[PDB]
């Protein structure tokens, strides 16, 4: 079929701390090879290829425009920080967490947002990190996330082992537990 | 709820055009001249020989910047101004700074502007003070928002505005281009005699709202 | 509260 | 760091199709909707507070399609090399029989942006309560993309996501069906 041209413009906004520290990437991307971009940190486009060498001199003698992209970290990036604050960094979804099974134990936290979670095992109030397998953070796409965090045991008559979850859409840590 | 530019009298429309297209700005002088504790005058110093009183919304403000090199800007007028002696006394509220108080670099706004949600192109203002009154950079908004968008023209479509400055910290302020609280620059400008300056450095950037 | 866009830029010819 | 807010855009040819949408961690919080002229919010939710002017969309996707051509020259008319997805069909959750579910079919590190995907019910195109989301962005420059199929888990029945891209010989068909 018919060859592909592809041009792509990506402007990222990088923040750290809140909105402390705000870097600007504005870059330019024909076909899968980024030609051209301008960092904040640098303050003036740079070509990243040769392609984008024409460009990159042609815009920095645009002062209107070079001060435009610099003041751009203020105008774009933070006023757009606080726009979705609300619904974005503020976000939080509980996850819904599971457990189920020489052996292999399941734990299963699903539903929650952010990614950012910690799920550790248990065996009688004693931390296993040991044969402890996963499937990593998985993105789900809809802005959930979800995991399984699995422990290889030997489980003997009484055993309790608890799986805990600490994530920031609950204060205390959430715990099931599974009785052998 | 924005004030509409029908609420003006064409008095203040004209009063509003005339001092942000063209504010009064003098770099550097000197004053050792309180006038009702409130002012500090500066003889001779004003537009065509005038001498100009700075009124300051309390004694403490105006004493601050006694005898000291001073940086002025801001709107000027005549009507209603307190007269010092036999020459003629011209009238500006706050607009003052230390004129030994430069920024490195010089430092540059940027300003977001929507009318009725459209997004527009983004305006720059510039400032090498250090420190700068919130004056100085409403003026300069509202000369581009003057020249770009006729904000202060009886026939023009935009009949409500709101500029906003943002601080990087989660700091705000805010006025309605409608509001004036009055025809006459004596009333119009009373609202900058605090003399309210922010940090360059701490500025973050201005967004515009206006509206047909 | 808006979204605001970064303007795209023209490249040289 | 902490966060990222990616304002993505890109225009195609010779299928002259663009995209503009805005990024936030690797989730889409909203596009502009090229044909309706509209922005689409990921969630219903951000759209109640937070707003965007569709027209501010085009104008940028008619000066990508302008570079687009300016690029494409400057290059020699080099197309772009075709880079097949990687397809894996998850689960939103852990599949218990007869308990709703949604089947996600994650298509990864592809280009150009253009896809063709059928979910298949035993055999036969589904339709009913499929959902997707547009290109997403990665730092390699290549695209994300997601489908789902809400389902009832059944022992009597066999899923299939189909994925058809230019740098496959054979469509991707990704397989599902309970185990038990
Ligand atoms: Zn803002």
New interface residues.
């Given amino acids: 079929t018919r060859p592909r041209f592809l041009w792509q413009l990506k402007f990222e906004c990088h923040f750290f701390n809140g909105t402390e520290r705000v870097r600007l990437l504005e870059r330019c991307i024909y076909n899968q090879e980024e030609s051209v971009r301008f960092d904040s940190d640098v303050g003036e486009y740079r070509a990243v290829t040769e392609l984008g060498r024409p460009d990159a001199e042609y815009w920095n003698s645009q002062k209107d425009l070079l001060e435009q992209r610099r003041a751009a970290v203020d105008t774009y990036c933070r006023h757009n920080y606080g726009v979705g604050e609300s619904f974005t960094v503020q976000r939080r979804v509980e996850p819904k967490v599971t457990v189920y099974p020489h052996n292999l134990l399941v734990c299963s936290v699903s539903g929650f947002y952010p990614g950012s979670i910690e799920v550790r095992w248990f065996r009688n109030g004693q931390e296993e990190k040991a044969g402890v397998v996963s499937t990593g953070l998985i993105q789900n796409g809809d802005w959930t996330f979800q995991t399984l965090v699995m422990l290889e045991t030997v489980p003997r008559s009484g055993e309790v082992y608890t799986c805990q979850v600490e994530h920031p859409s609950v204060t205390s840590p959430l715990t099931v537990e599974w009785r052998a | 709820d924005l004030h509409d530019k029908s609420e003006l009298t064409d008095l203040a429309l004209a009063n509003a055009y005339g001092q942000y297209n063209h504010p009064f700005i003098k770099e550097n002088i000197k004053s050792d001249e309180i006038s009702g504790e409130k002012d500090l005058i500066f003889r001779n110093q004003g537009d065509s020989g005038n001498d100009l009183r700075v009124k300051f919304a309390t004694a403490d403000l105006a004493q601050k910047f006694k005898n000291k090199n001073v940086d002025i800007y801001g709107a000027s007028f005549y009507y209603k101004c307190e007269k010092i002696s036999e020459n003629i006394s011209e009238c500006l509220y706050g607009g003052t700074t230390l004129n030994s108080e430069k920024l490195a670099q010089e430092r540059v706004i940027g300003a977001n502007v929507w009318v009725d949600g459209i997004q527009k192109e983004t305006e720059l203002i510039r400032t090498n003070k250090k420190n700068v009154t919130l004056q100085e950079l409403d003026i300069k908004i509202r000369k581009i928002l003057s020249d770009k968008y006729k904000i202060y023209y009886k026939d023009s479509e935009i009949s409500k505005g709101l500029i906003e400055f943002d601080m990087k910290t989660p700091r705000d302020y805010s006025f309605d281009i409608y509001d004036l609280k009055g025809e006459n620059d004596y009333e119009i400008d009373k609202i900058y005699e605090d003399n309210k300056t922010l940090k360059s450095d701490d500025i973050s950037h201005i967004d515009v709202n206006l509206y047909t | 509260?808006?979204?605001?866009?970064?303007?795209?830029?023209?490249?040289?010819? | 760091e902490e966060h990222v807010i990616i304002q993505a855009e890109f225009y195609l040819n010779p299928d002259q199709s663009g995209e503009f949408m805005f990024d936030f961690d690797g989730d889409e919080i909203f596009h502009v909707d090229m044909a309706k002229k509209e922005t689409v919010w990921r969630l219903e939710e951000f759209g109640r507070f937070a707003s965007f002017e569709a027209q501010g969309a085009l104008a940028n996707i008619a000066v990508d399609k302008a570079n687009l051509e300016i690029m494409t020259k400057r290059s020699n008319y080099t197309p772009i090399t075709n880079v097949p997805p990687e397809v894996t069909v998850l689960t939103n959750s852990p599949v218990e029989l007869r308990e709703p579910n949604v089947l996600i079919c994650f298509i990864d590190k592809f280009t150009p942006p253009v896809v063709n995907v059928t979910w298949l019910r035993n055999g036969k195109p589904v339709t009913t309560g499929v959902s997707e989301t547009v290109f997403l962005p990665r730092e390699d420059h290549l695209f994300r993309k997601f489908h789902y199929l809400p389902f009832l888990p059944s022992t009597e029945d066999v899923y299939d996501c189909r994925v058809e891209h230019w740098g496959l010989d054979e469509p991707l068909l990704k397989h599902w069906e309970f185990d038990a």
């Fill in positions: 509260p808006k979204y605001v866009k970064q303007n795209t830029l023209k490249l040289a010819t």
